[PDB]
Enzyme design. Sequence first.
Site, PDB file in Angstrom:
ATOM      1  N   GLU A   1       1.041  -1.383  -0.471  1.00 28.39           N
ATOM      2  CA  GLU A   1       0.194  -0.042  -0.125  1.00 28.39           C
ATOM      3  C   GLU A   1       0.780   1.145   0.038  1.00 28.39           C
ATOM      4  O   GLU A   1       1.306   1.952   0.707  1.00 28.39           O
ATOM      5  CB  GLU A   1      -0.740   0.070   1.125  1.00 28.39           C
ATOM      6  CG  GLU A   1      -1.969   0.849   0.617  1.00 28.39           C
ATOM      7  CD  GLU A   1      -2.962   0.652  -0.005  1.00 28.39           C
ATOM      8  OE1 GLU A   1      -2.988  -0.291  -0.678  1.00 28.39           O
ATOM      9  OE2 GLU A   1      -3.601   1.313  -0.844  1.00 28.39           O
TER      10      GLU A   1
ATOM     11  N   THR B   1      -2.674   4.705  -6.644  1.00 25.49           N
ATOM     12  CA  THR B   1      -2.733   6.112  -7.143  1.00 25.49           C
ATOM     13  C   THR B   1      -1.910   6.825  -8.088  1.00 25.49           C
ATOM     14  O   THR B   1      -2.205   7.387  -9.259  1.00 25.49           O
ATOM     15  CB  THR B   1      -2.379   6.762  -5.329  1.00 25.49           C
ATOM     16  OG1 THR B   1      -3.395   6.099  -5.025  1.00 25.49           O
ATOM     17  CG2 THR B   1      -2.581   8.663  -5.586  1.00 25.49           C
TER      18      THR B   1
ATOM     19  N   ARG C   1      -9.638 -12.673 -23.382  1.00 25.96           N
ATOM     20  CA  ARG C   1      -8.649 -12.547 -23.131  1.00 25.96           C
ATOM     21  C   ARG C   1      -8.256 -12.486 -21.130  1.00 25.96           C
ATOM     22  O   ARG C   1      -9.617 -12.139 -20.830  1.00 25.96           O
ATOM     23  CB  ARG C   1      -7.534 -11.101 -23.146  1.00 25.96           C
ATOM     24  CG  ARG C   1      -8.397 -10.025 -22.626  1.00 25.96           C
ATOM     25  CD  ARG C   1      -7.800  -8.727 -22.522  1.00 25.96           C
ATOM     26  NE  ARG C   1      -7.945  -8.139 -23.527  1.00 25.96           N
ATOM     27  CZ  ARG C   1      -8.896  -7.422 -24.502  1.00 25.96           C
ATOM     28  NH1 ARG C   1      -9.601  -7.550 -24.114  1.00 25.96           N
ATOM     29  NH2 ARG C   1      -8.478  -7.307 -25.920  1.00 25.96           N
TER      30      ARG C   1
ATOM     31  N   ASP D   1       4.493  -2.378 -14.172  1.00 23.86           N
ATOM     32  CA  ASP D   1       3.507  -3.132 -12.422  1.00 23.86           C
ATOM     33  C   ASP D   1       4.098  -4.318 -11.790  1.00 23.86           C
ATOM     34  O   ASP D   1       2.928  -5.213 -12.651  1.00 23.86           O
ATOM     35  CB  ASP D   1       2.351  -2.173 -12.052  1.00 23.86           C
ATOM     36  CG  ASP D   1       2.109  -2.530 -10.278  1.00 23.86           C
ATOM     37  OD1 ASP D   1       2.805  -2.427  -9.830  1.00 23.86           O
ATOM     38  OD2 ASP D   1       0.938  -2.331 -10.066  1.00 23.86           O
TER      39      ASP D   1
ATOM     40  N   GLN E   1       3.571  -9.590  -8.133  1.00 24.42           N
ATOM     41  CA  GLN E   1       4.728 -10.928  -8.571  1.00 24.42           C
ATOM     42  C   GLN E   1       5.072 -10.853  -7.378  1.00 24.42           C
ATOM     43  O   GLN E   1       5.670 -10.486  -6.948  1.00 24.42           O
ATOM     44  CB  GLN E   1       6.024 -10.711  -9.016  1.00 24.42           C
ATOM     45  CG  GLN E   1       5.124 -11.178 -10.905  1.00 24.42           C
ATOM     46  CD  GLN E   1       5.446 -12.110 -11.377  1.00 24.42           C
ATOM     47  OE1 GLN E   1       5.683 -13.341 -10.484  1.00 24.42           O
ATOM     48  NE2 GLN E   1       4.250 -13.296 -12.331  1.00 24.42           N
TER      49      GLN E   1
END
Lengths: 286, 57, 336, 235
Positions: free
Chosen positions: D40, D45, D59, D81, D85
């Site tokens: 977080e 954002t 997809r 991003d 993972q």
Amino acid sequence: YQVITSLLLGTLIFCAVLGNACVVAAIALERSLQNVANYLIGSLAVTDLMVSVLVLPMAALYQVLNKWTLGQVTCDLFIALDVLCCTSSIWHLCAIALDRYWAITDPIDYVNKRTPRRAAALISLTWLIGFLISIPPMLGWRTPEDRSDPDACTISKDHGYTIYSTFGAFYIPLLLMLVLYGRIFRAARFRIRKKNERNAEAKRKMALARERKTVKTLGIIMGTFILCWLPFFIVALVLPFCESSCHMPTLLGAIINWLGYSNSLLNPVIYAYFNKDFQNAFKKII
Amino acid sequence: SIAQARKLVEQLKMEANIDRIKVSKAAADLMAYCEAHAKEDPLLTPVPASENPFREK
Amino acid sequence: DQLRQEAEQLKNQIRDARKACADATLSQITNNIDPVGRIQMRTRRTLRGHLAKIYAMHWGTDSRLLVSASQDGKLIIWDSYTTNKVHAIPLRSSWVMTCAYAPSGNYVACGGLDNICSIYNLKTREGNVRVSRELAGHTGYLSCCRFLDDNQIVTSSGDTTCALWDIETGQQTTTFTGHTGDVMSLSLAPDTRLFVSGACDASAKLWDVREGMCRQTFTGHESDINAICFFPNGNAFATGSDDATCRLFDLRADQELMTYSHDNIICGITSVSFSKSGRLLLAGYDDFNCNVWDALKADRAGVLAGHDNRVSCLGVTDDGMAVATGSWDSFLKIWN
Amino acid sequence: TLSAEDKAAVERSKMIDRNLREDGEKAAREVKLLLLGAGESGKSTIVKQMKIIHEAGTRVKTTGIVETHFTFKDLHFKMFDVGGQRSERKKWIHCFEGVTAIIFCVALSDYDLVLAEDEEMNRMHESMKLFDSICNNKWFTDTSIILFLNKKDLFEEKIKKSPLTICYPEYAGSNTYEEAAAYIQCQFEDLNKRKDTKEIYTHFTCATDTKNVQFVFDAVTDVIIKNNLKDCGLF
Ligand SMILES: C/C=C\C/C=C\C/C=C/C/C=C/CCCC(=O)O[C@H](COC(=O)CCCCCCCCCCCCC)COP(=O)(O)O[C@H]1[C@H](O)[C@@H](O)[C@H](OP(=O)(O)O)[C@@H](O)[C@H]1O
Ligand SMILES: CC(C)CCC[C@@H](C)[C@H]1CC[C@H]2[C@@H]3CC=C4C[C@@H](OC(=O)CCC(=O)O)CC[C@]4(C)[C@H]3CC[C@]12C
Ligand SMILES: CC(C)CCC[C@@H](C)[C@H]1CC[C@H]2[C@@H]3CC=C4C[C@@H](OC(=O)CCC(=O)O)CC[C@]4(C)[C@H]3CC[C@]12C
Ligand SMILES: CCN(CC)C(=O)[C@@H]1C=C2c3cccc4[nH]cc(c34)C[C@H]2N(C)C1
């Protein structure tokens, strides 16, 4: 007598040919050396190789034998190849400066609009300017004095032609290179300028180191170009307008001509044998 | 993390009950396989270019 | 709880059994064998066209067509005999780190940082390759995938879990759990009943495809295992790791037989495969070199120098005629 | 050789090579950015701030890697991003070698908070450890880092309520937004061991629509210009 000069010219020509051929071969067989800037550095190397294998042997034979023993037609072919290959080399330096200026000042076009077609177009314009400087003397602008001496190979002394060739081969390229590298020097300084005390001192030392590096590199490029080509073109611009009272010693004239010729040997050192990628590629080859 | 401990100990006790052969026997069975198929190995014994698909048709 | 006591007791019992089964080392058994000798391999084909680092390749069963995967989001089907690009599949995700070519030659799989194993149908009516099925369900990056059959594929991913897929349905028929670290490599046994997986917990496990549990665990390496490959016999396998060591493990002996290490190599192994007879063990290294090891002697028999960045993938044809090594230099080289 | 099938195969190979070269030229015209940070840490954002009116230049959901494609001032950006993972980074962090810059997102308000795994582990310290690990990798030794200090208003409220001495015991200064923010920015910048090769661009994420994307664009253009200067021998 002339054996020492023969050996000196031979080793100069051999070094120039070897360096230019090595640069061309390294660009050809290396796969990281396949971008727009290295394409321009390879075209410059090809032009200098042409200078060293087509003009330099004949100029050395003229210098060693102290007379032209190849014929008037071969003399005209020598003058044409000399002006064409050397103007192309100077305009390659100018095109490299222009490409660096575009890459440094315009990152957007560097990312988007920069393609090898641009390098090919720049090379085409350099060779076209070389042709436009070397060919017109072959078609007109030939006073009888040029062929009046069978045992000589001299360029045209016409005031209009000497102005045109001397300006469009050196002085316009020189002014353009000076302006482009001044703008590059301004951009580089602008990028360099932009406990806490220790970090600030380290940043300041880094900034002065980078400023010294950019001054040294630009000085190397511009001083090599100047000291190689400026002495010759000053004489090439003054002597045609001074019919008398300006006798030119053979020693100094040969020295300023061979400084211009050795620019083609110095160019691979300045543009290829200094950057890290070329050195790494050459070491990988060896 | 106790529920996974039972599964782990069951896995170990199931692994420990397998039948194992002598290492000499295993080495002999690898030697026999390597020597029996040595003549059929193009990489070990270079193949003539007449029947080499990557050199001549 | 107190289960750790009997856990370590069982570990000691397994170690004692392995030591008892160890009477003579492999070197002593094979000492009388004459050396295979210095081996001469030269690059025969250089497959060009990839514009980024190559992370995986896989040979066809016909020993002529191979698939390569690279970071430029392309899955090129080569023709190694004539250096012709049969296909060039555009990947939806350019982050691909594995590829497999089906034994039937009809399908090709690939996967990567995206946790999906994409199945591509090569042979179709219109002649244009299309995504057959996208196999989702892994929670980590797909590390390796091997076509168990024309309809079954076994995958290994960076979520410590290998899975068996049903391509027709798209669901995980069996999930193989037990690894403690990221599973990096996968190799199917020739009999198509077992497979081994080398994970980041410095261990390799033998799995039963039908029964779906770990038969055996081999712990010899000192770092994470990056490559695994069965011996052609099917009773052994070699593992490559970042320990800069290759280790031959035997299924029946349930322990390590040979260690393939040298003082001059300190770079991890990224790829391992055997020759057709199993005598040669070919391994790709992080120093853009491939070392051919005498699998029965632990002596280097040759070096396949010629790559520039890092040999990341390496495979030998089923007929054993040639070995292909793809590297991060965007070039695949057939050696033979 | 002269057979029809061989000619057709070579023609198909040449067409495929042409398509590959065209695709590679098209892909080289894109700036690739790697987005990183804690859980977080305001990465979402920042991503949402990038995607306002400009995007895209059966997809199955990936959830492994998310690519954000946006264009700002005729420059194509691809932002990757890798928050989803959940695995060992060293086994795939080399796949992102060669990105133009790394966008590291850290929330300023997590200095007071602690991770759920253990109480004696600050979230800000975890972010600093991640920044240190990613800034000094053998793969990103040449890659500049764009640092985003998110949650400036929440950070201001928190420091007005709770002091910064809990996160930094060595901190000694007035509890004000300017001084504490500068201290955090300096602590994150002091983790750059490769001072001579790479540069860290720090921006405080603001609610203005285009300032964050403008900062990213300025940092990327600065990186490209400095790379060109280094190639020319002028930097
Ligand atoms: C008064 C105060 C201060 C000033 C006083 C003194 C100090 C400075 C004096 C002036 C400098 C003179 C020349 C310095 C050469 C020198 O140090 O060169 C360095 C290493 O080279 C070698 O080690 C050896 C050279 C290369 C290897 C040999 C090449 C082959 C030669 C024969 C060729 C023909 C036969 C094959 C490399 O160059 P560099 O580190 O000096 O710095 C730069 C260079 O100046 C830029 O031109 C270059 O730009 P590019 O055009 O894109 O390449 C940059 O990339 C970078 O290399
Ligand atoms: C035609 C041939 C025979 C000429 C051979 C000599 C050139 C290679 C010379 C002429 C002028 C020289 C330059 C004159 C002055 C300088 C500044 C000098 O000082 C610096 O390090 C710059 C930074 C600083 O001074 O703070 C570095 C070398 C340099 C670029 C010199 C590089 C070598 C040059 C180009
Ligand atoms: C910067 C690096 C690449 C060194 C470059 C050096 C050259 C400019 C030198 C090396 C050998 C020199 C030559 C050696 C000997 C002679 C013969 C010499 O002969 C005379 O002056 C008498 C006969 C006549 O010219 O009539 C004239 C200069 C010349 C051509 C020299 C011109 C300048 C040269 C080509
Ligand atoms: C007796 C030697 N000769 C006749 C062959 C010259 O004067 C050469 C002619 C040149 C020349 C004239 C006019 C314009 C030009 N641009 C580039 C060059 C050039 C090259 C230049 N070289 C160095 C000397």
